[PDB]
Amino acid sequence: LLPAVNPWDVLLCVSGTVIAGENALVVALIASTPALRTPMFVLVGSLATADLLAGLGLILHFVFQYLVPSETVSLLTVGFLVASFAASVSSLLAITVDRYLSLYNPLTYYSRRTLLGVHLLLAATWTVSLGLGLLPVLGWNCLAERAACSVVRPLARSHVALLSAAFFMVFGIMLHLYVRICQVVWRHAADLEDNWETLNDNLKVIEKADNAAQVKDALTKMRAAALDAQKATPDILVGQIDDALKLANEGKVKEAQAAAEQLKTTRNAYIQKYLAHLAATRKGVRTLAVVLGTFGACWLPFAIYCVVGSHEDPAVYTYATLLPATLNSMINPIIYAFRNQEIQRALWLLLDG
């Protein structure tokens, strides 16, 4: 398709309908499903709305780039594409802090600070994304004799470059947070083993002592280890330790040890529970990793070409950089369905009349 410019367009022309359609479906499910009202999925919905504007913007671009009322309207549509890109990258960052903050300390991840911040994230996102998309309609265009146009007219090279430079820095920070997220998950997975080691060491030393105090020390060091596992990623175990502790103090070494050995019944069920949650956390973080990789891999080529390209360069270099960026909004709805089970359930929920 090197010499085929319009066939490059027709590929994107109908692809905008797909991107507009599929995202329009996702935004509905988040809005129409209470289980998806959690901050994670609300922020994902914003990305869908951002990816939604991408499909609408280019659809109206072709509809107006070919037999439109006027070109000034086409200068609004480019704002939609600008607005979508800012609304997509901005919200994509927002999902990262939600993951980091949620994993960093869920107890501090309360329904007050979080839900408050969530509305500001979307508000601070779209108020800026739209604002950037509206700047061209206030003079930030390239249709002047003293302004050089970019690969995507009427956007000027000066302004697309600032967006490109801003995008690199924003994407550079999102990578840093993802590592911090990993550090959080690693740390949450590290202190857990220490509690398990101390918890098991305490159980064993309980048997290897004939003093009623050695039992108290191990249980006290055991209760603290049990408690530390709760503050990390927020009953019967500690409750049974309390019952075990209640016996140790009042001279019940023989029977207090018996209660310590029933903890294994709960502890075996207690340990088997935490492992699954980290599996859910890793996949949730893993899905975050995949999304970030696709976003950059599909937008970065355009981010560079719009700054280092020349108007003496062929057009195929333009679409070759827009094609991944355009279809990036088509792929984002697909990723969550195949990875995130909570939203995938609603997708296959509708099965028959």
Ligand X SMILES: Cc1cc2nc(NC(C)C)c(N3CCN(Cc4ccc(F)cc4F)CC3)nc2cn1
Distance, CA of 197 to CA of 256 (rounded, Å) = 21
Residue 54 binds ligand X (CB under 6 A): yes
Closest to ligand X by CB, 233 vs 326, is 326
Residue with nearest beta carbon to Na ion: 88
First to last CA, the chain: 43
Write out the two tokens for 226: 């049990």
In the set 248, 328, 336, 343, which binds Na ion (CB under 5 A)? 328
Least CB distance to ligand X at residue 65 (A): 7
Say if CB 303 and CB 167 are below 8 A apart: yes
Residue 223's nearest CA partner among 249, 202, 254, 253 is 202
Write out the two tokens for 300: 């970065």
Least CB distance to Na ion at residue 51 (A): 5
Q: Which residues of 229-260 are buried (b: 16+ CB within 10 A; e: fewer)?
A: beebbeeebbebbeebbebbeeebbeebbebb
Least CB distance to Na ion at residue 315 (A): 23
Closest to ligand X by CB, 39 vs 55, is 55
Which residues in the 77-136 window bind ligand X by CB under 6 A? 78, 81-82, 84-85
Closest to ligand X by CB, 100 vs 295, is 295
For residue 304, CA distances in Å to 176, 184, 246, 280, 297 come to: 21, 33, 68, 36, 12
Residue 321 binds ligand X (CB under 6 A): no
Site string for ligand X, 146-175 (x = CB under 6 A): ------x--x----x--xx--x--------
Least CB distance to ligand X at residue 86 (A): 8
Give the residues across from 149 on adjacent strands. Answer: 156
160 makes contact, choosing from Na ion, ligand X, none, with CB < 5 to 8 Å by partner type, with: ligand X
Closest to ligand X by CB, 132 vs 259, is 132
Say if CB 154 and CB 108 are below 8 A apart: no
In the set 39, 45, 61, 154, which binds ligand X (CB under 6 A)? 61
Residue 22's identity, in one-letter code, is: E
CB atoms within 10 A of CB 146: 4
Say if CB 312 and CB 337 are below 8 A apart: no
In the set 174, 185, 229, 322, which binds ligand X (CB under 6 A)? 322
61 makes contact, choosing from Na ion, ligand X, none, with CB < 5 to 8 Å by partner type, with: ligand X
In the set 88, 96, 240, 281, which binds Na ion (CB under 5 A)? 88
Residue 188's nearest CA partner among 221, 230, 159 is 230
Closest to ligand X by CB, 55 vs 284, is 55
Q: At what angle do helices 113-134 and 39-65 cross, to 10 degrees?
A: 10
325 makes contact, choosing from Na ion, ligand X, none, with CB < 5 to 8 Å by partner type, with: ligand X
Least CB distance to Na ion at residue 181 (A): 20
For Na ion, the binding residues (CB under 5 A) are: 88, 328-329
For ligand X, the binding residues (CB under 6 A) are: 9, 54, 58, 61, 78, 81-82, 84-85, 152, 155, 160, 163-164, 167, 302-303, 306, 322, 325-326
